[PDB]
A paper describes a structure:
A key group of these are the respiratory chain supercomplexes (SCs); these which primarily consist of complexes I, III2 and IV (CI, CIII2 and CIV) in varying stoichiometries, which serve as the minimal functional units for NADH:O2 oxidoreduction. Here we report in situ structures of porcine respiratory SCs, determined directly through imaging porcine mitochondria by single-particle analysis combined with cryo-electron tomography (cryo-ET). Our structures, with an average resolution of approximately 2.5 Å and local resolution up to 1.8 Å in the best regions, enable in-depth study of mitochondrial respiratory SCs in their native states. Our in situ structures also capture numerous reactive intermediates within these respiratory supercomplexes, shedding light on the dynamic processes of the ubiquinone/ubiquinol exchange mechanism in complex I and the Q-cycle in complex III.
CIII2 transfers electrons from ubiquinol to cytochrome c (cyt c) and contributes to the proton gradient for ATP synthesis. Comprising three core subunits (cyt b, cyt c1 and the Rieske iron–sulfur protein (ISP)) along with eight auxiliary subunits, each CIII hosts four metal centres (haems bH and bL in cyt b, the [2Fe–2S] cluster in ISP and haem c1 in cyt c1) and two Q sites: Qi for Q reduction and Qo for QH2 oxidation. In addition to the apo form, we resolved four distinct Q-bound states. In states II, III and IV, Q10 takes on the prevalent conformation revealed in our cryo-EM maps, while the Rieske domain undergoes a stepwise movement from the b position towards the c position, eventually making contact with cyt c1 for electron transfer in state IV. To further analyse the detailed conformational changes among these states, we measured two characteristic distances, one from [2Fe–2S] to Q10 and the other to haem c1. Our results indicate a possible sequential progression from state I to state IV, characterized by increasing [2Fe–2S]–Q10 distances and decreasing [2Fe–2S]–haem c1 distances. On the basis of these observations, we propose a model that outlines the coupling between ISP movement and Q-binding states.
Author numbering:
A (entry chain 3R): 79 to 110
B (entry chain 3C): 110 to 379
C (entry chain 3N): 2 to 446
D (entry chain 3V): 47 to 77
E (entry chain 3X): 1 to 52
F (entry chain 3F): 24 to 121
G (entry chain 3O): 22 to 438
H (entry chain 3C), I (entry chain 3P): 1 to 55
Write the structure that this text describes.
């Protein structure tokens, strides 16, 4: 049942840099 | 330690409140003593002179100083009340200390049935003394020169503060240097904070340290000598007596007490 | 013979490579036992949403039927010589290793070839295996440690294949048919992404010709053109709170983005992770253990067990700590543990750095005893680092790192970085996410 | 631990005498 | 106290915290000069001496 | 010689009058309370009874009668070994910290 | 690069092997444990096992912990019913310090009253943690219901002794069951000279043989408790034979003939005769496995079972019936060969790990006092015949049996049936 | 039902302050001055107010 | 050893009164007028004192 737990989509609130799902977040963490 | 430091802060605030309040009647002694005490801050390097212009509200002690002293004298006692509440909180966390110095956790009694009526008796005795002073010798400790309009054209014969201020004022008198005088004056009370560090005897109290008892009574007599000297003018031999007692004050607090405590521990196999 | 002299001996890990791409690596020694296994790059990282959990299902059905071996006959042969056959499928890799004697090597390689290659994948066995996975799902849901780590993976790498659980959601396991599994096997069980490992009484030449005579049929083809590609994942500092007050204890795991599999900063980080250390209530050190957080926890009986993990995938990993404590300790540790990180971030001295170096050296050397740990090390290192790093190189890297390196590495990884906390149980005193994030920086530094 | 499966139950049936063990920095374990 | 602070790791802590504390001191000095409008220092700095 | 001065000081101290041994009078700092906790049951019970009796006496301001005062030669330093052990352990920990 | 099995005149026997490994492990194996406990000092062995970090004669608790952690080695005091094994290990450049710490812990404890009183709660914590797994309770009740005394003693402090074990009991246990004649120092990755020096330097202080224990006699009890677990854990066992004997090897072979342990993960245990015998009939989650415990004085052989509450009657019966078939001459030679191969593999596989080799050498030194090469053990295993196995099965079937059960026992058959 | 003395917040604070606060039995008169100070504070403040009403 | 925020006497009161006080998650702006009142006290008291020094 815990496998069925998933995080909902936060793309409505996400910043532009972290919007993409392939690039990491460390390079944009500095600017944010 | 926390209660002790808060008590030192309370003591500072009380001295400031009393010094400030004695100005309010605006007698000769009030104004002239205020001029002297506030002008003592001119000895502070650099900013010090400007400070005495700031505190005075102008060029010297005038109406602005009087009204600001009144306002601060009003506000300060409530700060004293808050600090007293904090001081009681810190003490209540750990509990009071018995004369022996040993922890009394095994023998503790409730406060209400006993230590209310005892404090009632103490307060009644204090009232006995206080109304004796008020009703039979009202202007006993106060200088008669206060009962005179403050005329800035005539310096009084002797400018002196209250009896509870004469000891530190005599310490100020003792040191020749002006800035060193203010430093010694402030240290004469600030040295209380150093006391927790200077304790070295294995016994907290003094019931079982007769040498420390003699040193403490020597200190008390030295403070009485400081008060008496501060009352007297700075002439021979009051100059030398005041200087010597001023040195002996710090010498007892900083040197004689700790060395006596080391000898004390050595005398008891520990 | 000092440590350095014994470190060099370290029988080597000769690595060969078949024309199919199967890199056969062995480690000869003197014991009469051996561990031979195939480490394939196949896990939840490559699985997509529709077939998430196919790897677990294939691992389940691998030992059941393998055509040439009709079925339980495989079990009969494995138990005939006393071999213990085992499989572990993590989020990235998946291995089927046979733990057997040295003499049974020719048969063991054949059995591994039968499992990884010719698997019947019978539909009836799929139906029977379907119930088992669902049952194991409930057991894992009861596993109060596994679920918090799954929650951390879900909340950290959200929207990425990494967040997908290894077993899979309990909806795909009720729909995964033969076609999905066969596609998974075809597209992931490929020779180039495979390492045939064997440690113990193994002759490298013997393993080589056994692989040539058995594993030759494997090909690197990818049907028409479909080639699975590693998709980099993003670390999303977040928080998931599954508060279930009925649970006796509280699990909280806090992690930040760390290094990848191939990154030198991994070596200092573990040293730092050694300084914090780990503690369990049944330790005995109590108020004397050198780890400041462990000593503080033992003094007040704060937690029941805290550990520090260094989960590290290819491009990114999870660096942090998982602690189990009662309801009214989560705040305190969250203040203390973070503070420890901050101290390691702020002012680290050579004394505890040396302590961590010794702890890491001991962990590496003691982890590498016995045939199966060596075989697992070879299989994982060839796939991750591209080679088995000898212990001498590890010694060199550990000797290089000092207090300045630890401080700078922790500052680059820990200082002012959004965490990925994940809780379970009566988590109520757990500080709000902004409190945790604020704890990530120290107003004195 | 929940063991509501035959395959997951495999190995839980002990066949050798109990052997207690506790370390100093290692959690206690039994067999 | 005296001896218990006189250790190798304690001087290591001192060396680690010298930069942050030292430039906290610069923060405090700049804040004091700013708040008091200290003309002795502010005169030399450019673009602010114009305020006088 | 010095032992005469030591005996004079013991007589002039006061806690011999109150029926207190020497270790009953020592200030209770962290080392001391830890040592007190480390005491055996019998010694701790005698210590607490002695302290309670002394506090009673100074509350009433009645010194304990002459004959059963703690003599100099009958004074036993019961706390001393435990306090020495506590101080040694603390010093060892501080040396390790340095 | 070999095992030098030297023995000292006092009784201490030193074994060492210079494998030139990066890490080294030194272990002192003492012939002390629960079996040597008496009715009064019950649980003292558990405290001593938990007593591995208190202040020694020449090393304080803080010093011991800090030194062992800074060096990075470990200290595990793994214990059995009749042997307590102290063991340290770390890098080979500094095993001297940890060996000295171990030596102080073993041959020179102080057992300060305050530290022991503080450690008392660790007894309850460790007992609860170990008893979380149902197998511990079932095995402990099996040993309680199998022998009148000696081996009947538990590895964990009984509830009424938690907080009662005084340091005097610890000291009596130390200088009554830690004498030189009943210990053995075994080192992996260390040289014989230094081990001999430290052996004759520190452990020579405790000479003699020590207070001898008592023989354990079969009682045939049926200790049963209704814990309420969904899975019923049962164990029916008869006195097989003492270890280090032909019947011991015969019963060991019979254990694998019956089947003990799943070789293939998530398998069906086709070769396991017990698993296949019970598989027909019951169709619910169940496990059955042969159980062998070969203590020095006496041994126990039987059947362990984890089954559903309702089916507990069948799984106990059918599995037992399987043994009857083996008793009445139904053992194929191929099955015997397979069991012999499994036994050889298991023995060569336990000693595979360095710690496995360490405890193997420790057990050989403590029990037999004569270390034999693994090839000798394999030869002894091969020496076993089918007639000896079929028995051993006869001895298990005919002899009186002790049964232990836990869970919902509403359907568990009693030992009388 | 619970004591208003030690359940009502203000009364609980007063109770723990100077009603049921444990105190040493052998406290001499030298400690009474503490309370005296508080008295000598209040007796001051009130009087000051009246003085401030004609100053 | 322990956090000063939840161990120091005054700091404990400040912590459990203003720092870690559990407040409802959805209080509107109308509740904020509480704090303003207190501020509107201090902000006005400090001014009020400064007039007392010239009045
Ligand atoms: C006649 C000769 C003796 C005159 C008093 C001096 C003296 O030797 O006092 C000894 C003695 C004080 O010294 P102690 O007994 O060694 O110590 C008692 C503690 O200080 C604790 O004392 P206590 O609080 O139980 O009661 C006495 C205390 C009480 O003090 C107060 O209540 C505060 C006012 C005094 C300051 O006042 C004094 O100790 C001051 C004594 C000198 C002024 C009288 O007092 C008495 O025996 C009687 C005091 C009252 C007499 C009326
Ligand atoms: C355009 C339509 C006319 C103006 C809006 C009012 C209206 O027709 O319906 C109010 C309409 C219905 O009331 P509600 O939002 O269901 O409930 C009351 C709010 O929760 C109460 O407000 P809130 O706590 O949801 O949000 C604060 C809100 C309103 O803030 C306040 O009402 C408190 C501060 C101002 C108090 C004195 C002016 C009233 O602030 C503003 O609307 C603008 C900033 C005002 C300065 C303070 C920041 O709410 C709004 O339009 C926003 C809040 C009220 C604004 C007035
Ligand atoms: C549930 O919501 C709450 C708030 O705001 C929504 C708050 O602001 C505060 C905190 C409030 C303040 C710090 C100030 C406002 C009011 C008070 C009564 C606090 C005490 C008084 C003063 C700060 C002013 C007088 C003090 C001095 C001169 C609290 C406790 C609160 O509980
Ligand atoms: C303290 C040092 C900084 C303040 C100072 O001296 O002057 C600051 C500023 C600028 O001073 P300034 O540079 O115009 O003159 C310095 C010399 N005195 C102070 C004697 C006039 O002055 C003040 O803030 C007033 C003096 C008292 C400050 C307290
Ligand atoms: C200065 C005082 C500081 C505080 C002192 C302690 C608290 C005093 C006030 C509370 C109190 O005593 O209330 C008594 C009474 C309540 O009812 P009662 O049954 O007496 O008590 C129930 C709870 N214990 O409440 C009453 O009002 C008493 C009955 C009416 C008056 C007569
Ligand atoms: C109308 C209220 C909230 C704050 C409560 C008090 C917290 C505190 O004491 O902070 C100062 C801190 C004390 O130490 P701390 O970091 O809390 O760690 C304690 C570990 N037991 O202090 C320190 O850690 C170091 C000392 C202070 C350094 C300040 C440096 C910058 C100065 C400008
Ligand atoms: C504003 C005036 C003061 C008030 C109202 C006040 C209030 C109190 C009270 C009521 C007590 C408990 C009774 C007692 O022990 O005497 C006390 C204790 C104490 N006060 Fe004060 N105090 C004041 C000033 C001071 C000063 C100036 C100091 C010294 C710096 C101080 C230090 C202490 C100490 C050390 C104790 C504990 C005494 C003990 O436990 O034996 N106080 N205070
Ligand atoms: C901390 C307690 C206080 C002390 C130690 C104190 C001290 C003094 C002193 C020494 C004087 C001069 C007395 C004289 O003329 O000889 C004075 C005057 C005065 N005080 Fe206070 N005071 C206190 C509290 C207060 C408070 C709370 C107020 C305000 C409500 C106040 C208002 C006044 C006024 C109006 C005067 C002028 C009247 C006069 O001098 O007699 N005092 N104060
Ligand atoms: C409850 C809080 C208070 C309120 C609402 C308040 C309100 C007022 C108002 C409306 C005035 C008349 C101002 C004018 O007509 O221009 C006034 C006068 C005054 N208040 Fe207050 N006051 C408060 C507290 C205080 C405090 C605490 C002080 C002293 C620290 C103070 C000192 C004065 C003085 C000296 C005046 C006369 C000068 C003036 O009129 O501005 N007040 N007050």
């Amino acid at each position: 049942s815990h496998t069925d737990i998933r995080v909902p989509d936060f793309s409505d609130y996400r910043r532009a840099e972290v919007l993409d799902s392939t690039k990491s977040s460390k390079e944009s963490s500095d600017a944010r | 330690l926390e209660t002790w430091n808060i008590g030192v802060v309370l003591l500072f605030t009380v001295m400031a409140t009393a010094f400030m309040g004695y100005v309010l009647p605006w007698g000769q002694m009030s104004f002239w003593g205020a001029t002297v005490i506030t002008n003592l801050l001119s000895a502070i390097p650099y900013i010090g002179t400007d400070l005495v212009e700031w505190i005075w509200g102008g060029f010297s002690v005038d109406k602005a100083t009087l009204t600001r002293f009144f306002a601060f004298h009003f506000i300060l006692p409530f700060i004293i009340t808050a600090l007293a509440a904090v001081h009681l909180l810190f003490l209540h966390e750990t509990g009071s200390n018995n004369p022996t110095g040993i922890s009394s956790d095994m023998d503790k009694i409730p406060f209400h049935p006993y230590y209310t009526i005892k404090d009632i008796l103490g307060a009644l005795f204090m009232m006995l003394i206080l109304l004796i002073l008020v009703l039979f010798s009202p202007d006993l400790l106060g200088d008669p020169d206060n009962y005179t309009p403050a005329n800035p054209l005539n310096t009084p014969p002797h400018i002196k503060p209250e009896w509870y201020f004469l000891f530190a004022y005599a310490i100020l008198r003792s040191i020749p240097n002006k800035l060193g005088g203010v430093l010694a004056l402030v240290a004469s009370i600030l040295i209380l904070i150093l006391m927790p560090m200077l304790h070295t005897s294995k016994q907290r109290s003094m019931m079982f340290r007769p040498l420390s008892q003699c040193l403490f009574w020597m200190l008390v007599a030295d403070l009485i000598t400081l008060t008496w000297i501060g009352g007297q003018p700075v002439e021979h031999p009051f100059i030398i007596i005041g200087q010597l007692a001023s040195i002996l004050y710090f010498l007892i607090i900083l040197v004689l007490m700790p060395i006596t405590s080391i000898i004390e521990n050595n005398l008891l196999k520990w | 013979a000092t440590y350095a002299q014994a470190l060099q001996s370290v029988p080597e890990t000769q690595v060969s490579q078949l024309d199919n791409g199967l890199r056969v690596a062995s480690e000869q020694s003197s014991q009469p036992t051996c561990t031979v296994g195939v480490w394939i790059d196949a896990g939840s990282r490559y699985e997509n949403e529709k077939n998430n959990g196919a790897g677990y299902f294939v691992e389940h059905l691998a030992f059941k039927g393998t055509k040439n071996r009709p079925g339980s006959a495989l079990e009969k042969e494995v138990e005939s010589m006393g071999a213990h056959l085992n499989a572990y499928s993590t989020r990235e890799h998946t291995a089927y290793y046979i733990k057997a004697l040295s003499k049974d090597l020719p048969k063991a390689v054949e059995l591994l070839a039968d499992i990884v290659q010719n698997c019947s994948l019978e539909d009836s066995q799929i139906e029977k295996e379907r119930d088992v996975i669902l049952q194991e799902l409930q057991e894992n849901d009861s596993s109060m440690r596994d679920v918090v780590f799954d929650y951390l993976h879900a909340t950290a790498f959200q929207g990425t294949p990494l967040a997908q659980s290894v077993e899979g959601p309990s909806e795909n396991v009720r729909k995964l048919s033969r076609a999905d599994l066969t596609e998974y096997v075809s597209q992931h069980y490929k020779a180039p992404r495979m390492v045939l490992a064997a440690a113990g009484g193994v002759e490298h030449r013997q393993l080589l010709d056994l692989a040539q005579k058995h594993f030759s049929s494997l090909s690197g083809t990818y049907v028409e053109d479909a080639v699975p590609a590693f998709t980099p994942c993003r670390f999303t500092g977040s928080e998931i709170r599954h508060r279930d007050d009925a649970l006796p204890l509280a699990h909280v795991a806090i992690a930040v983005e760390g290094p990848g599999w191939a990154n030198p900063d991994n070596v200092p980080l573990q040293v730092a992770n050694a300084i914090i250390g780990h503690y369990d209530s049944t330790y005995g050190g109590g108020t004397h253990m050198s780890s400041t957080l462990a000593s503080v926890a033992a003094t007040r009986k704060l937690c029941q067990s805290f550990q520090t993990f260094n989960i590290c995938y290819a491009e990114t990993g999870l660096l942090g700590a998982h602690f189990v404590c009662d309801n009214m300790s989560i705040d305190d540790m969250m203040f203390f543990l973070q503070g420890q990180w901050m101290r390691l971030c702020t002012s680290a001295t050579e004394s505890e750095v040396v302590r961590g170096k010794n702890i890491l050296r001991n962990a590496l050397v003691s982890h590498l005893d016995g045939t199966t740990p060596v075989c697992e090390d070879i299989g994982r290192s060839l796939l991750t680092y591209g080679r088995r790093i000898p212990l001498a190189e590890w010694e060199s890297r550990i000797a290089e790192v000092d207090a300045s390196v630890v401080r700078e590495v922790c500052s680059k990884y820990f200082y002012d970085q959004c965490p990925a906390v994940a809780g379970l149980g009566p988590i109520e005193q757990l500080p709000d996410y902004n409190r945790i994030r604020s704890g990530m920086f120290w107003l004195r530094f | 631990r929940s063991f509501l499966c035959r395959e997951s139950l495999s190995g839980q049936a002990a066949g050798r005498p109990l052997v207690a063990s506790v370390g100093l920095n290692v959690p206690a374990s039994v067999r | 106290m005296l001896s218990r602070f006189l250790g190798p790791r304690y001087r290591e802590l001192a060396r680690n915290w010298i930069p942050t504390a030292s430039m906290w001191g610069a923060v405090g000095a700049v804040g004091l000069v700013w708040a008091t409008d200290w003309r002795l220092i502010l005169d030399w700095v450019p673009y602010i001496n114009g305020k006088f | 010689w010095l032992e005469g001065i030591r005996k004079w000081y013991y007589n002039a101290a006061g806690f011999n009058k109150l029926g207190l041994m020497r270790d009953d009078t020592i200030y209770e700092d962290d080392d001391v309370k830890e040592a007190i906790r480390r005491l055996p049951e019998n010694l701790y019970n005698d210590r607490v009874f002695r302290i309670k009796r002394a506090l009673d006496l100074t509350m009433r301001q009645q010194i304990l009668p002459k004959e059963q005062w703690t003599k100099y030669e009958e004074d036993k330093f019961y706390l001393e070994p435990y306090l020495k052990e506590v101080i040694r352990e603390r010093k060892e920990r501080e040396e390790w910290a340095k | 690069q070999d095992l030098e099995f030297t023995r000292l005149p006092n009784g201490l026997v030193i074994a060492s092997l210079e494998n030139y490994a990066p890490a080294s492990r030194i272990g002192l194996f003492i012939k002390a444990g629960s079996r040597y406990e008496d009715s009064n000092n019950l649980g003292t062995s558990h405290l001593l096992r938990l007593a591995s970090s208190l202040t020694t004669k020449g090393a304080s608790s803080f010093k011991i912990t800090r030194g062992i952690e800074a060096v990075g080695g470990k200290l595990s005091v793994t214990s059995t019913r009749e042997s307590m094994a102290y063991t340290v290990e770390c890098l080979r450049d500094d095993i001297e310090i940890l060996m000295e710490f171990l030596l102080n812990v073993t041959a020179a404890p102080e057992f300060r009253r305050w530290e022991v009183a503080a450690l008392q709660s660790q007894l309850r914590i460790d007992k609860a943690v170990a008893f979380q797994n149902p197998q511990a309770q079932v095995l402990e009740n099996l040993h309680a219901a199998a022998y009148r005394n000696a081996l009947a003693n538990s590895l964990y402090c009984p509830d009424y002794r938690i907080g009662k074990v005084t340091p005097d009991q610890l000291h009596y246990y130390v200088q009554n069951h830690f004498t030189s004649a009943r210990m053995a120092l075994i080192g992996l990755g260390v040289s014989h000279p230094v081990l001999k020096q430290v052996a004759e330097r520190f452990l020579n202080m405790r000479g003699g043989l020590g207070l001898s224990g008592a023989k354990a006699k079969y009682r045939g009890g049926e200790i049963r408790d209704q814990n309420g677990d969904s899975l019923v854990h049962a164990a029916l066992v008869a006195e097989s034979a003492a270890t280090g004997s032909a019947e011991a090897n015969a019963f060991s072979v019979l254990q694998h003939v019956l089947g003990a342990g799943p070789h293939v993960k998530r398998g069906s245990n086709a070769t396991s005769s017990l698993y296949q015998a019970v598989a027909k009939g019951v169709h619910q989650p169940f496990d059955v496995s042969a159980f062998n415990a070969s203590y020095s004085d006496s041994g126990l052989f039987g059947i362990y079972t984890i089954s559903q509450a309702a089916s507990a009657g069948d799984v106990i019966k059918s599995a037992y019936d399987q043994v009857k078939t083996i008793a009445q001459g139904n053992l194929s030679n191929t099955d015997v060969q397979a069991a012999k191969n499994k036994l050889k593999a298991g023995y060569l596989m336990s000693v595979e790990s360095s710690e496995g080799f360490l405890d193997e050498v420790g057990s050989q030194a403590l029990v037999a006092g004569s270390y034999v090469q693994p090839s000798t053990v394999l030869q002894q295993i091969d020496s076993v015949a089918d007639a000896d196995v079929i028995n051993a099965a006869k001895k298990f079937v005919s002899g009186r049996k002790s049964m232990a059960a836990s869970g919902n026992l509403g359907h568990t058959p009693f030992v009388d049936e | 039902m619970t004591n208003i003395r030690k359940s009502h917040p203000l009364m609980k604070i007063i109770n723990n302050a100077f009603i049921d606060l444990p105190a040493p039995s052998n406290i001499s008169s030298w400690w009474n001055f503490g309370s005296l100070l508080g008295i000598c504070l209040i007796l001051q403040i009130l009087t000051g107010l009246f003085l401030a009403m004609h100053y």
